[PDB]
């Protein structure tokens, strides 16, 4: 029962290093380990991670090996190095959450009562999905469905911790996408937001197409019981707005007349002084 999960920038680098280290000697295209954090409240700040040997058999995708002995040994050493970290879940790449998901969650649940698995990719940036968090709740069903694995999603956001924010600041020190160049950045933000909305709507469209063609089961219970209501408040007020959008004029009064007047007068005065100075200097030179 977690409202949100926050990842410390050290963990993302941890996963990226793991993927590079293995893939330099690997081709299975899946690095999987178990992380540690502090389940202080509804929020769970995963703050560090390690590795664990993991091999999986492509036949049936159901034969594998996770060295729980490695689990205990690694955790013991990390406990000696610091006692404030508790094992709270695992991590793995390969956005294609493979079959042995609930199985591994079962195996690792013998070290936590509320284990939460956050999936970390090593690639995309166009959208804003650096990671997503999943939980293994086996609530049987509602309505009339049979039981199943029924993994679930927990909201996530990449966090920070002082003395590490400094590290990242230095490590980047080039893009510096802060309020620098504020007007240009605001326009780029409006463009990027439109692109993101396009992408999300397109994903919804693809799912709707796939469900209508019958390829996938109709998730009446929750998937579209919310899409309909969302479709139900695409603000359509187009009768009194014709007069409710004179607040645009209220903004425009300032943002046009006052700003343009001030900048025009200032520029005129600056030109006046510069020309006067240069003319006097040239005249006096000879």
């Amino acid at each position: 029962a977690v409202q949100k999960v926050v990842v410390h920038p050290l963990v993302l680098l941890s996963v990226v290093d793991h993927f590079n280290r293995i893939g330099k000697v690997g081709n299975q295209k899946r690095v999987v380990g178990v992380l540690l954090g502090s389940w202080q409240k509804k929020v769970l700040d995963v703050s560090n991670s390690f590795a664990v040997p993991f091999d999986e058999d492509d036949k049936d995708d159901s034969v594998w090996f996770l060295d729980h002995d490695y689990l205990e040994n690694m955790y013991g050493m990390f406990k000696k190095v610091n006692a404030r970290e508790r094992i709270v879940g695992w991590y793995h790449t390969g956005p294609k959450l493979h079959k042995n998901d609930i199985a591994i969650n079962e195996l690792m649940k013998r070290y936590c009562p509320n284990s939460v698995l956050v999936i970390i990719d090593v690639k995309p940036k166009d959208l804003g999905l650096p990671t997503e968090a999943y939980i293994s709740v086996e609530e049987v069903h509602d309505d009339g469905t049979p039981t199943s694995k029924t993994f679930e999603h927990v909201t996530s956001e990449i966090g920070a911790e002082e003395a590490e924010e400094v590290g990242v600041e230095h490590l980047l020190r080039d893009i510096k996408d802060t309020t620098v160049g504020t007007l240009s950045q605001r326009i780029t933000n409006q463009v990027h937001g439109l692109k993101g909305l396009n992408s999300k709507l397109l994903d919804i469209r693809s799912y709707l197409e796939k469900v209508a063609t019958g390829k996938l089961p109709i998730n009446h219970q929750i998937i579209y019981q919310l899409q309909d209501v969302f479709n139900l408040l695409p603000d359509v007020s187009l009768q009194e707005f014709v007069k409710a959008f004179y607040l645009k004029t209220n903004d425009q009064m300032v943002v046009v007349y006052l700003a343009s007047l001030i900048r025009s007068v200032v520029a005129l005065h600056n030109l006046i002084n510069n020309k006067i100075a240069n003319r006097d200097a040239e005249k006096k030179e000879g």
Binding site: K176, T178, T179, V180, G181
Partner: protein, 70 residues
């Protein structure tokens, strides 16, 4: 670059700070300030700060590793 630099200079007046007293003033960009410790120091003064609120005595903060009037 300039915008980043202004942000960086602004980022010096935050965080924990230590209180002291503006004992006396010297050439601009510099002054002498007391301290909560009681070991009156010599400090450099941030330019962006005001000038009409620097009373002969006053409560001012100082950087922990710089003891600069921020």
């Amino acid at each position: 670059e300039f915008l980043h630099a202004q942000e960086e200079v602004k980022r010096i007046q935050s965080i924990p700070l230590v209180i002291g007293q503006f004992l006396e003033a010297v050439d601009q960009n510099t002054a002498i300030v007391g301290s909560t410790t009681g070991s009156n120091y010599y400090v450099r003064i941030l330019s962006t700060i005001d000038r009409e609120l620097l009373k002969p005595n006053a409560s001012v903060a100082l950087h922990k590793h710089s003891n600069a009037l921020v």
